[PDB]
Design a protein around this nucleic acid. Structure first.
Ligand code: DCP
Ligand code: MG
Lengths: 553, 406
DNA sequence: TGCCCCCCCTTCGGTGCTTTGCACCGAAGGGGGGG
């Protein structure tokens, strides 16, 4: 029945009127199915017939619901949504089963036709008008307007969720040791009461909902485990995901691979070790969802690795506030990381992965810091605190990073864990110049108009060189000059550039880059024994720099 | 009482900023604080038909366990009308930075006794989140002058003047400066006698409705040049590059006579003797760097900017300017926490003290340029914030080319 | 042929710098999942 709750007032955006779009013509057979749908809603007062004075319209359709014999009605409010006022959505996130505590007695209820039991602001209803064409448009046809929240309107989800929160608020305060997870219209209700008094409180909640017009059909009332909830299965001591089925295909299109990656991401919350870097790489540089992409060798391997992981069964456990949260991260290669969160060993609450490339140039320590940050945020959301960490980086390594790196950087209290591959700085720059090492004065210049440049050096041991460069930039020639000095020097080198751009990248100790040229420089720094790297201002006659600058010119 | 008509700036809409996640202890505190405020009618439960939002969180001082709600109105304040356009703004007294000690008092509670323009309240909505998204967010808007809104000190200015003037009447030697929800009260009395007239001030206000700063210890540290008795080619290149940078700030600094000391393609570790004409150049440049730069004055119509550099071993350098290379203040912040393991905590405390100094000195906070990744800052900073205000800031990544400020 | 939310991966376009490309960042496309 329609809630007697007060309506929420809503406005159109200023200056805008209502939608006015002819319903697409449809067959007479579907038209009276249409007719059928509205006749019965009209008997519950969910809609009312209107006429030609109302100058607005919007078209209607329906999709099969997974019910045996039920259907979903929908009206294409795309245009009205555009002209409706902006809303502050109150759904801030998705509850996760790893955030639940063990409960003695559990129930899952769903409200029936939640949207159609919430009324719509009276002054607004005339903008929800829709027409059902009659006699193949020979006559004007039947016209209705909504008296309740329409499915397909921009404001319906928020107003319904907001209305449910006010209806639940009395019952939550009345009995504070009953957990109620409220997701749209789905209610998880847990308690530490014996199943006797539990079911009393349940019936009492149901009656409270029904006085406000929210039915709870028996069909959607789950009373025994395993409970179906939010895509998972809740068992008394553990939880699992509902079965994940991945596409198996002879020929793969872009859109197929897009679906596969998304399934694997969804699986990564409980299946440890999932990787998607090589599968997602197939989507780069493509131009159509229907374009057929052949799997690379590395993508077949990664897919096969994920398939072996997924055929093992797995479960998460529930949250024990009386114990610490522990998060352990492993390194997987090519910028991929995987993590487990647990409280007792080998009993995961959940798992996850971090694999984003932030920036054109980075290194493992930065990315480890980013994974730590992602896990820290996820933990606040699910449990309201951050975990203690277990990381495969030595205290010496981290300390060498936050001293020789100029940006403030911190990670929370952690313990070293020996699970190779370890995270390590792949080279360090000397703080002082190296005695007995050759001194290279590097420089590169480019002509922006011609896109032609040179890179070269001169040396205290008397060495000199100049390489022509075609189709390059100013910044590339400078990187190129450092590239050659590292190429032609020994294990220990002193280098002096006048490009703080180049100094800026390299001083940050990157171990990977989207640039092949920067990648080449990294491979060379890793081979070296000692490197000192010094900057000087250009075009000031400084001995060394001016010699090489003149040579490059 | 009658409300004062308030407007946003022409062509601007209210704030639409997402709530970020909060820990358990902070969510609990907001829920206790906000439900007591709703009972007293200071805020009102609202729904999603209000399209505006502003992030909220909570801060607990080391000295006082009592939690303090803190709303980030930074966006709202940028879009609110000037109250210097309506001339309802309050000036800053240049007699505060002269004082021996300055205490800071949180007087935000005085605002909760003045109603806010019915048409403006919707712009003040905020949303309390849910652990594990157990429920949708809970929304309120203010009915009274909000803490942290730039309009509250302006609307309530007149009320503040009359509450204080007996105290100012009776202590003409003390200077009191309101800055948003805070009173900065400075005096020259002895360390323990100063504190007692602080508590006398408290109960005059308590009748109706942090720690001691010390400004004359806010030493200015300038640009320094090393001194050794031997000088390598690398030492002179590092010094030439450092003074070539300083010539953008100071005037009459020359490098011609240390530059061609390095004539030729030399090794970096070869020890070059100093010309007499080079010691002439260097001993001179050292004292242009001695005393401050002629011709740099504060301008209240322009913003203040603050740059910070991490230097290591717990130390942090900073510069405050309005035009580039015309610093009004250069300083060095040190950490006395003793933990010696946090870089974000140190920077967070550095921003509060630097900002505090600009309030005492100029009456407003600068926009910071922070040497940290956006996502590292945002993961942790609220853990260490203790001020009732929040400055503007942006994130920068510039490696040192010179270590100019060491 | 509809709506709202979270997540990930890719691509695109705006901003600002004592630039002439570059690096950063937010938004919008695709996908997963929930209702
Ligand atoms: N494809 C979908 C699924 C759900 N919803 C919104 C409207 C629904 O009212 C509500 C909940 O959907 P349910 O699956 O729980 O089923 P109904 O509420 O529509 O009907 P009933 O629960 O009585 O079977 O979420 C939607 O707009 N589109
Ligand atoms: Mg329902």
């Amino acid at each position: 029945p329609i809630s007697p709750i007060e309506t929420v007032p809503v406005k159109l955006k200023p200056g805008m009127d209502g939608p006015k779009v002819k319903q697409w013509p449809l067959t007479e057979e579907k038209i009276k199915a249409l007719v059928e749908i509205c006749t019965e809603m009209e008997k519950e007062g969910k809609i009312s017939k209107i006429g030609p004075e109302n100058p607005y319209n919007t078209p209607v359709f329906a999709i099969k619901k997974k019910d045996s014999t039920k259907w979903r009605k929908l009206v294409d409010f795309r245009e009205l949504n555009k002209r409706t006022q902006d809303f502050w959505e109150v759904q801030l996130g998705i509850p996760h089963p790893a955030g639940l505590k063990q409960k003695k007695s559990v129930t899952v209820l769903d409200v029936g036709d939640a949207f159609y039991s919430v009324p719509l602001d009276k002054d607004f209803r005339k903008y929800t008008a829709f027409t059902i064409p009659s006699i193949n448009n020979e006559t004007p046809g039947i016209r209705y307007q909504y008296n309740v929240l329409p499915m397909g309107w921009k404001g319906s989800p928020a107003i319904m969720q907001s209305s449910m929160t006010k209806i639940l608020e009395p019952f939550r305060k009345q009995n504070p040791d009953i957990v109620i997870y409220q997701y749209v219209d789905d209610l998880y209700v847990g308690s530490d009461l014996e199943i006797g008094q539990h079911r009393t409180k349940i019936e009492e909640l149901r009656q409270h909902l029904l006085r406000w017009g929210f039915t709870t059909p028996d069909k959607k009332h789950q009373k025994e485990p395993p409970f179906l909830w939010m895509g998972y299965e809740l068992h008394p001591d553990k939880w699992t995901v509902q079965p994940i089925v991945l596409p198996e295909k002879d020929s793969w299109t872009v859109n197929d691979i897009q679906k596969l990656v998304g399934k694997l991401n969804w699986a990564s919350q409980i299946y440890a070790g999932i990787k998607v870097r090589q599968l997602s790489k197939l989507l780069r540089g493509t131009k159509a969802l229907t374009e057929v992409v052949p799997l690379t060798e590395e993508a077949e391997l990664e897919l096969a690795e994920n398939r072996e992981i997924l055929k093992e069964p797995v479960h998460g456990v529930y949250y024990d506030p009386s114990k610490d949260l522990i998060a352990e991260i492993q390194k997987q290669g090519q910028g991929q990381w995987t993590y487990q969160i647990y409280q007792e060993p080998f009993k995961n609450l959940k798992t996850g992965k971090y694999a984003r490339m932030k920036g054109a140039h980075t290194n493992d320590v930065k990315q480890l810091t980013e994974a730590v940050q992602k896990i820290a945020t996820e933990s606040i959301v699910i449990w309201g605190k951050t975990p203690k960490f277990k990381l495969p980086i030595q205290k010496e390594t981290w300390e060498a990073w936050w001293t020789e790196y100029w940006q403030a950087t911190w990670i929370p209290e952690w313990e070293f864990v020996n699970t190779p591959p370890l995270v390590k700085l792949w080279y360090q720059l000397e703080k002082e110049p190296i005695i007995g090492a050759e001194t290279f004065y590097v420089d590169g210049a480019a002509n922006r108009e011609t896109k032609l440049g040179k890179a070269g050096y001169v040396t205290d041991r008397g060495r000199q060189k100049v390489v022509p460069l075609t189709d390059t930039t100013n910044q590339k020639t400078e990187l190129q000059a450092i590239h050659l000095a590292l190429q032609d020097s020994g294990l220990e080198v002193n280098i002096v550039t006048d490009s703080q751009y180049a100094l800026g990248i390299i001083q940050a100790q990157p171990d990977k880059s989207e640039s092949e040229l920067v990648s080449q420089i990294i491979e060379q720094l890793i081979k070296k024994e000692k490197v000192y790297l010094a900057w000087v201002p250009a075009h000031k006659g400084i001995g060394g720099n001016e010699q090489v600058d003149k040579l490059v010119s | 009482i009658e409300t004062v008509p308030v407007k946003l700036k022409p062509g601007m809409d209210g704030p639409k900023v997402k709530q970020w996640p909060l820990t358990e202890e902070k969510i609990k505190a907001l829920v206790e604080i906000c439900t007591e405020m709703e009972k007293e009618g200071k805020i009102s439960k609202i729904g999603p038909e209000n399209p505006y939002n502003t992030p909220v969180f909570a801060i607990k001082k080391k000295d006082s366990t009592k939690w303090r709600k803190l709303v980030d109105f930074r966006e709202l304040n940028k879009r609110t009308q000037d109250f210097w356009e309506v001339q309802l703004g309050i000036p800053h007294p240049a007699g505060l930075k002269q004082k021996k000690s300055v205490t800071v008092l949180d007087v935000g509670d005085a605002y909760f006794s003045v109603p806010l323009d019915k048409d403006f309240r919707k712009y003040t909505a905020f949303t309390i989140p849910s652990i594990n998204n157990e429920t949708p967010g809970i929304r309120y808007q203010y009915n009274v002058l909000p803490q942290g809104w730039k309009g509250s000190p302006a609307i309530f200015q007149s009320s503040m003047t009359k509450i204080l003037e007996p105290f100012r009447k009776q202590n003409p030697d003390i200077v009191i400066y309101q800055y948003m929800d805070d009173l900065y009260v400075g005096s020259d009395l002895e360390i323990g006698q100063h504190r007692t007239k602080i508590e006398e001030l408290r109960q005059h206000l308590l009748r109706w409705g942090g720690y001691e700063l010390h400004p004359d210890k806010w030493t200015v540290q300038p640009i320094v040049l090393p001194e050794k008795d031997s000088w390598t080619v690398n030492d002179i290149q590092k010094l030439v590059g450092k003074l070539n940078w300083a010539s953008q700030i100071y005037a009459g600094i020359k490098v011609r006579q240390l530059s061609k000391l390095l004539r030729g393609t030399k090794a970096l570790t070869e020890v070059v003797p100093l010309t007499e004409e080079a010691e002439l150049e260097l001993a001179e440049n050292r004292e242009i760097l001695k005393e401050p730069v002629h011709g740099v004055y504060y301008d209240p119509s322009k913003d203040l900017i603050a740059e910070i550099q991490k230097q290591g071993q717990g130390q942090w350098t900073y510069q405050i300017y309005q035009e580039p290379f015309k610093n009004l203040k250069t300083g060095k912040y040190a950490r006395m926490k003793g933990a010696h393991t946090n870089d974000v905590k140190q920077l967070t405390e550095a921003v509060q003290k630097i900002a505090t100094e600009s309030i005492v000195i100029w009456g407003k906070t600068p926009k910071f340029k922070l040497p940290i990744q956006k996502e590292t800052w945002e993961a942790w900073w609220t853990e260490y914030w203790q001020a009732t205000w929040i400055p503007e800031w942006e994130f920068v990544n510039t490696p040192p080319l010179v270590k100019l400020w060491y």
